[PDB]
Amino acid sequence: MVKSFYGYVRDAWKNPDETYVNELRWERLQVWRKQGSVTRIERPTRIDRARSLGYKAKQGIVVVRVNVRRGGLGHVRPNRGRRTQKMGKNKVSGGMSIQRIAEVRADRRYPNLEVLNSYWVGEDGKHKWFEVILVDPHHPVIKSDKNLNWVCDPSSRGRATRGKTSAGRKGRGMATRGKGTEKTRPSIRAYKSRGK
Amino acid sequence: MKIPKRFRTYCPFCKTHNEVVVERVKKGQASSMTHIARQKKRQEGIGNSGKFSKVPGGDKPTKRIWLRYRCTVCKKAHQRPCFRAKKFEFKE
RNA sequence: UUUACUGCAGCCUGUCGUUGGGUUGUGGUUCUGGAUGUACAGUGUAGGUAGGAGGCAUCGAAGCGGGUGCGCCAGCAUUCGUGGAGCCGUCCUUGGGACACUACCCUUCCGGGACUACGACCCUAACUCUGAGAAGAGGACCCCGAUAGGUGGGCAGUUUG
RNA sequence: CAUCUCAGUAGGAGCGGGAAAAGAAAUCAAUUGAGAUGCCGUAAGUAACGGCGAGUGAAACCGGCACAGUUCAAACCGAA
Ligand SMILES: [Mg+2]
Ligand SMILES: [Mg+2]
Ligand SMILES: [Mg+2]
Ligand SMILES: [Mg+2]
Ligand SMILES: [Mg+2]
Ligand SMILES: [Mg+2]
Ligand SMILES: [Mg+2]
Ligand SMILES: [Zn+2]
């Protein structure tokens, strides 16, 4: 079958535990642990996924590995008097996924760019790693572009901290239509947050 | 307090008087698929849980004797309002 | 305040992940050498069972060995021989099962090799501590995320007609 | 009074414009149909939940306001 090499990379990352990618994981995890919270990397770790999510090789497009802990929302026991249903907090995991946390940290680190998408790249017993694709709206190469000039608009500022990314809309309960989405569209706030 | 193993009594299905066999009604075990059990699962979270943290209730000085009269022709049982006795021999 | 009712933190322990490479004892999983299948024996070893029997055989078939799969040191296989016929059974050892080659598909045998789960031991490369660093010391344990059970006036909400 | 209610309310953190959010079916229907989204009316205090107590509580069909559809990834060419 006449197939592109993106297909082969996709297949290789389809089942990481049963290919050559496991050894590469073993080497890469050490170097990744030595690094910081947010790091700029020249090339994406998985080319096919990045191209699928809207990555091109031009100026003004940046890619970054973020580092986020595992587990639920670490929550404090209430100091004062609750009612025995609000008193417990150890089993109460959060309401925000880990991709959203990763993208928000990346946005906080880069004040001039704007988040586009992200994807899963690895994980171990203490950490998870994602890569976030960032686009610069004030670069002339982006402005001339016809498939990316929508980001040079006054409604795309802070695009990641208002739940407009793909993971944000997954977490808002708006990944589908029909039954079950009675109280999740066009927004959570519109229904007094009884959805989600 | 004795009662015969067999005797002759009206059968509501055959609509005639004929022999019956008396036996003891043994309380079964509650299953886990009835809607009360599903509700108990749905209501277990953090803290108190309403009906499902109720303390078990007391008991009465003497229960009733629960008996089932099974016919010997059609094999269809029927139940009758039950009396209250402490020691119940079953005198065949 | 407490051995009042209901809960929640903290702590103790099992399981899953992080988490790798060997030493062997475990059990099947899985695989070979023989239908191993044999008491009323046998000329025969129920070549499971079984067209209740017909093809093999100096053009290879026998009684015996420490005994060759194995078992009743009998004897179907032809194996290391040994004599140089065990033929089918309509002479059925007239059967627990009565038996003949293109069938053993299957009592079984089980280097049990093989991935697996357990108990113990060893190794370093993950990981942890110390150091500016070389390096040193531990080590797949601990910490950590999740889940299950306990103890728990440390703390919370209430009741005490 | 403990589940429930008060209520996702009061309060907090982040982002942000003249508006914002949503938006072109892996949809709703029922036998056979409709054809992106938002807002108003109705369905309806109905279905559903609940010491089945107190209470909480929709959507689709249907009528209106206003109407608008498209762009990438890949298969083919390989710097055009
Ligand atoms: Mg930071
Ligand atoms: Mg908009
Ligand atoms: Mg107290
Ligand atoms: Mg109160
Ligand atoms: Mg501002
Ligand atoms: Mg959208
Ligand atoms: Mg409510
Ligand atoms: Zn009767």
Swiss-Prot record, chain A:
A biological-process GO annotation: cytoplasmic translation
One term under GO cellular component: cytosolic large ribosomal subunit
Bilayer-spanning residue ranges: none
Basic residues biased stretches: 159-172
Keyword hit for Ribonucleoprotein: yes
GO molecular function annotations of the record: RNA binding; structural constituent of ribosome
Pfam families xref list: Ribosomal_L15e
Keyword field: Ribonucleoprotein, Ribosomal protein
Record region (Disordered): 153-196
HAMAP family listed in its UniProt record: Ribosomal_eL15
PANTHER family: LARGE RIBOSOMAL SUBUNIT PROTEIN EL15 (PTHR11847:SF4), RIBOSOMAL PROTEIN L15 (PTHR11847)
Family: Belongs to the eukaryotic ribosomal protein eL15 family.
Protein name: Large ribosomal subunit protein eL15
